């Protein structure tokens, strides 16, 4: 488990910081609209590793 | 061998893992993961991919 | 999302996505392996069934990066399977 | 840090480029894809 | 709505319930008499 957890940590999170230098942009609605582009993968993917 | 004499499995398996089971477990598991590839996504190339 | 949503990009849309998030990929796998390192071996007899399950994954993750970002399929798959015809 | 230079060096060149040259070629890359399989 | 989603959500059911055929009891009526127990002995 160790590794597909860390794996789903990892993402989200420098999802973010893509989005704070590809758009220089550190604030709320950057961390909001990064996972806009992630929220539709992270619950499919859930649901076929199911 | 001679007449009376029969045989039983005593006692080895009754079914095993990599006989009928895992093949059937892979088999489900791919009927769903196509699935929920579909569920978020409507096509009929993404889940191929 | 970047085909849709954005425009289209035939064979520039996958490879636009690449381009911007190869990092995530190689981020995770690799602190993957190196988390699975000390089953491999370094332990090698308070459990001999740590060997028996990281050797079938660093085997499965060696040849999981080093290929899906590249080489063969998962860029050359929705090329022929999306697009060629409908 | 050079680290961080050579890092966007390889996911800019590299790769990206030789990703180009992947998708250039199609029939070769399946032909292995099957290679692997058998 | 969407047509997809919707088909998946059927397609759970086609096993789920098919496979559920394959795995309980085709019998016939159920039990319903008040279960009893039974001594016997024999003086012959």
């Known amino acids: 488990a160790i590794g597909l957890l860390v794996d789903d940590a990892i993402v989200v999170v420098e999802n973010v910081e893509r989005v704070m230098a590809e758009e220089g942009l550190p604030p709320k609605e950057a961390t909001r609209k990064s996972m806009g582009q992630i929220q539709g993968a992270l619950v499919g993917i859930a649901m076929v590793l199911s | 061998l001679p007449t009376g004499v029969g045989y039983d499995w005593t006692g080895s398996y009754q079914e095993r893992l990599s006989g009928n089971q895992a093949p059937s477990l892979y088999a489900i ?19 191929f991919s | ?29 690799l602190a993957f392996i190196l988390g699975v390192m000390p089953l491999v071996i ?21 040849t999981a990066t080093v290929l899906a970002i590249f080489f063969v399929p998962v860029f050359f798959v929705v090329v022929r399977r999306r697009f060629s015809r409908k | 840090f050079g680290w961080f230079n ?27 894809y099957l290679i692997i399989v058998v | 709505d969407r047509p997809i989603f919707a088909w998946v959500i059927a397609i759970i059911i086609m096993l789920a319930g098919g496979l559920a ?23 012959p």
């Open chain 3, 42 to 62: 370094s332990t090698g007899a308070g459990s001999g069934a740590q060997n028996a399950v990281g050797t079938g994954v660093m085997g499965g993750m060696v």
């Open chain 2, 29 to 47: 598991s791919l009927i769903v993961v196509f699935l929920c590839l579909a569920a978020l996504y409507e096509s009929w190339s993404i889940p």
């Open chain 4, 6 to 32: 050579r890092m966007f060096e390889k996911s800019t060149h590299h790769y990206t480029d030789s990703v180009g040259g992947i998708l250039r070629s199609t029939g070769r890359y399946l032909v292995l």
């Open chain 5, 21 to 43: 055929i394959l795995k309980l009891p085709v019998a016939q009526y159920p039990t319903i008499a008040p279960p009893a127990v039974t001594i016997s002995a024999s003086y």
């Open chain 3, 1 to 29: 999302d970047l085909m849709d949503k954005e425009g289209k990009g035939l064979i520039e849309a996958t490879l636009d996505a690449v381009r911007m998030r190869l990092r995530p990929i190689l981020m995770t796998s």
